[PDB]
Symmetry: D2
Subunit: 263 residues, 4 copies
């Protein structure tokens, strides 16, 4: 199936590893030029190198904290200088939480609000005008199954991802007049490095069988009884931002292996 | 993006015209063999001929009423004998309604229950064993946006489509152990023959401006302010049934131009 | 808080035991006259006597199958005969299922369709006219948490209850012009006879700790870690049918001790 | 119906006028003592006098900004000093927004986050321990129908009310172990002074018929074709915080005259 995004410019936040890198490889595979965004400079250089070598597309690196207005303004200025504007924006930067409401500090709340919601708000403000000038585009928000089905141990994550899923919906209605399609993707269990680090930490005193720990997670949560690969998730991001998904507007698409328990 | 379904067997109910035909064309393009199912045999021939002539695939026609157990049995036996079993089943046969709860006959409720729900129950019972034996597969239920956001004039449609959406999710959990992935797609406004028929009928005594009538429907209901083409929609069905959507299980995916008013 | 329903006529289907009898007692307490509806004549006669004797309200018994048109007709005609019309209607008759989609007979699908969906359809058709003539009224559909969050073992129950929940909403918009407010209640785990019966059955060969079994069910499904009593749930049915809930139209209200896993 | 809250202490934020004052009167009518919280000292002082005279319960005034940590600490301190703790907490303080995402300043996103979400986080942290110590209680969050069905003109409101609804759910699962029941209420159109102010402003130049403007709003959005009264809404607040709603946990209850367009 032709995706029709050859030569389009795709900005992916949090794209030096895990889901965000797999997303960047999937767009690169389809001929899209890539803007990679993350904090660690070295991992970012590796990712760019590998994308260029494997896929022969242009890759720009922006090494900034997207949870800050300065960081966002640098992404916007770098995209403008190198490419003129973006055709695709994937908001993927984000991270799990771990607290009780009774004990969490206000600053922790603030931090996930800036990272999960304010980054998407500021990137929409900064990139929509260029995308509009280029004739339209696609914006995706990677929220989470937690945005609707909260996990008990991460209330701040649940709340901020919930806010992000609403944000995506409100942006979709505001920019569709610009021929800009906005949608949300809500992933289930996706096997990424932090899951492995967590599985090892939690099994350190009972045998170290981190793979069995992950298998029990999938057994308890997903009818599919396994985690997804980042690559299988990325496919959906690429599809939704392609010329083949032109009637998707303001929707939330779950990619979750049966984990959502309700209709 | 490679779909990986070349040479797979796709059964599409309601595929002699409109959306079902566009879906069959989308699968045929990707090299899938096609079983077309509809009642009227004239249009089934014309569609089948056009698919073989345009895409070079095998097409089996089954002219039956899928709202009957005998019709479904015929489809199951045609697939078994011609192909062994199906890899893909798309439940698409269905039709709008138009009544009030206070006036509609019990027999009309029963008609839509058979067509929208029991056809899918019976096809799953009949085709899942062969699909299992082939190593897995994909099943899609075309419900509608109305399965969650009911349109005032068609309560029977709304109820039976809601029931269909729940069926899809329950079948999803039952059969994922067989590597069979079941999902639902909920389309918004899709420009099909019946819409154009209706527009022309509703404007016959006031100017015959059927295009104007369709445009006001779009403006009323969809932020994108147009209907989808059946081809735009077909893409989603093709993607969901492909080797690129292998983590989609028990989900309901809206394709609606913004029409869904809630999160 | 005054419910303002003294002297009103409440029809409760499935009201010789369990949740239905608790709902009838809740209405009786507030001085409503009661139409009790259930199949077993003596259980119904006994429920009627005890309501009349505890609460001093009028009680009419209609011993019929509400899953049949003739049974619904008998209810409508006894209401008309004894009271003129109903002010309140609670669709409560229903029962659990237990099957796989691969194995269940079409006839079983049919039975649950008749009992969960068509009874409410036919009772709305039969009772709305008299309710309208009395100046308005309230109708409730007792669906289930399973209407949105399906239980693995009872797909027919899940599909038919989801259908009921949609019916409730579509009826809501049709009859609000008559000052009739229709809403749905979705209960979680409610301790009824069948629950205790099932706990005793499933523990007959392992120790007969039926209390242990129910506790584990509650522990698995509900954050509050107990079943509701039928009387706790009844309060909500009485409130929603009262002069204090005059802005509730077309809603679904969960009463589930935390069991719903999503927003 | 006995609510069983006579002598309990209910804290209501934003209760010097509108919905919060109606809720405070509703608890008062039921014999609950009242903690009134709002910024404007004058309106608060008189709302307090008028409640005591009219209902003969105790009334504590706390004139603070609950969007600030200092404001919340003053509430918690004054409740501790005057009553020991609270039995009931209603988070009601909040206000509409009005902007585009493209134009809104970061400061404005921040203000709505503090007011609609952080007020509830901070009041949960400050009041739950006293509520726990009293044997349990009830907490309500007044979010909005906009939490799931966004209004085009107030993206910040839609996003922060969505976050508040998720917060309510995450809190409910955390504190149910303390015998504290947390739920959310999502009102539709409720006739409060800002609606009237708005209807006048927007009719200033076309005839001044502010009532007909409100009627056109109700006609467009609500099948019941009128706004609710604050007193109408308040009944559901008092019910949910009463001893008659003991199985309601982590639910979202809409009170919206049919406004919600989906199931
Ligand atoms: N894994 C899972 O099971 C699921 C994940 N998700 C969502 O997917 C998204 C990606 O998660 P995943 O791939 O697991 O996470 P990883 O931790 O593997 O990847 C995070 C990426 O984002 C970058 N990043 C983190 N914070 C910032 C920041 N402030 N500014 C710029 N870049 C940042 C990281 O690089 P660096 O540290 O150098 O900044 C890294 O490239 C997240 O939004 C997550 O919530 C949703 C559902 C499930
Ligand atoms: N068009 C739209 O805006 C939307 C449509 N949908 C759904 O899409 C699906 C396809 O509809 P659409 O393309 O619009 O409609 P069409 O009328 O254009 O297509 C209906 C197809 O179903 C066949 N059909 C109808 N009843 C039966 C039956 N009992 N047995 C076998 N085939 C049958 C028809 O052929 P024949 O009569 O010859 O049997 C025809 O091929 C339906 O389920 C509809 O509810 C969902 C959302 C929006
Ligand atoms: N119990 C629970 O945990 C939950 C229950 N529900 C729903 O609550 C409702 C009542 O359930 P519950 O109290 O548990 O069940 P019970 O079996 O204890 O009560 C069911 C009532 O319905 C009557 N009934 C059943 N079939 C018919 C029929 N065809 N015609 C007329 N009356 C009938 C029964 O009497 P008779 O047999 O004499 O006809 C009985 O009085 C049902 O809709 C159920 O689906 C929803 C969620 C949870
Ligand atoms: N009216 C409607 O149609 C709907 C309203 N709602 C929600 O209902 C709630 C009540 O709104 P409504 O009654 O309409 O609004 P009003 O503006 O009429 O009342 C707001 C009350 O809250 C107080 N308040 C506002 N901000 C603060 C603050 N920062 N700290 C302390 N008190 C504050 C106000 O007093 P003061 O200004 O002196 O501080 C006033 O007493 C809100 O949460 C709103 O979002 C939900 C759905 C619909």
């Amino acid at each position: 199936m032709d995706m029709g995004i050859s030569g389009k410019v795709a900005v992916i936040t949090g794209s030096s590893s895990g889901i965000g890198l797999a997303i960047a490889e999937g767009f690169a595979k389809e001929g899209a030029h890539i803007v990679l965004v993350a904090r660690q400079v070295d991992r970012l250089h590796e990712a760019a190198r590998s994308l260029k070598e494997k896929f022969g597309v242009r890759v720009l690196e922006v090494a900034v904290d997207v949870a800050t207005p300065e960081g966002v303004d640098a992404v916007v200025e770098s995209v403008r200088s190198s490419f003129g504007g973006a055709d695709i924006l994937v908001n993927n930067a984000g991270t799990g939480s771990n607290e009780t409401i009774m004990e969490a500090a206000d600053e922790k709340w603030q931090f996930y609000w800036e990272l999960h919601v304010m980054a998407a708000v500021r990137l929409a403000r900064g990139l929509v005008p260029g995308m509009r000038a280029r004739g339209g585009g696609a914006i995706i928000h990677n929220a989470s199954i937690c945005a609707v089905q909260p996990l008990w141990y991460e209330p701040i994550y649940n709340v901020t991802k919930a806010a992000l899923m609403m944000f995506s919906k409100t942006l979709a209605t505001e920019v569709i007049k610009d021929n800009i399609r906005v949608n949300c993707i809500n992933p289930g269990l996706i096997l990424t490095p932090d899951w492995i680090k967590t599985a090892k930490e939690l099994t350190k005193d009972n045998g170290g069988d981190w793979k069995g720990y992950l298998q029990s997670v999938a057994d308890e949560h997903a009818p599919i009884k396994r985690f997804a690969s980042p690559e299988e998730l990325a496919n959906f991001f690429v599809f939704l931002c392609s010329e083949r998904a032109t009637y998707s507007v303001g929707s939330a698409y779950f990619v979750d292996g049966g984990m959502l328990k309700t209709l």
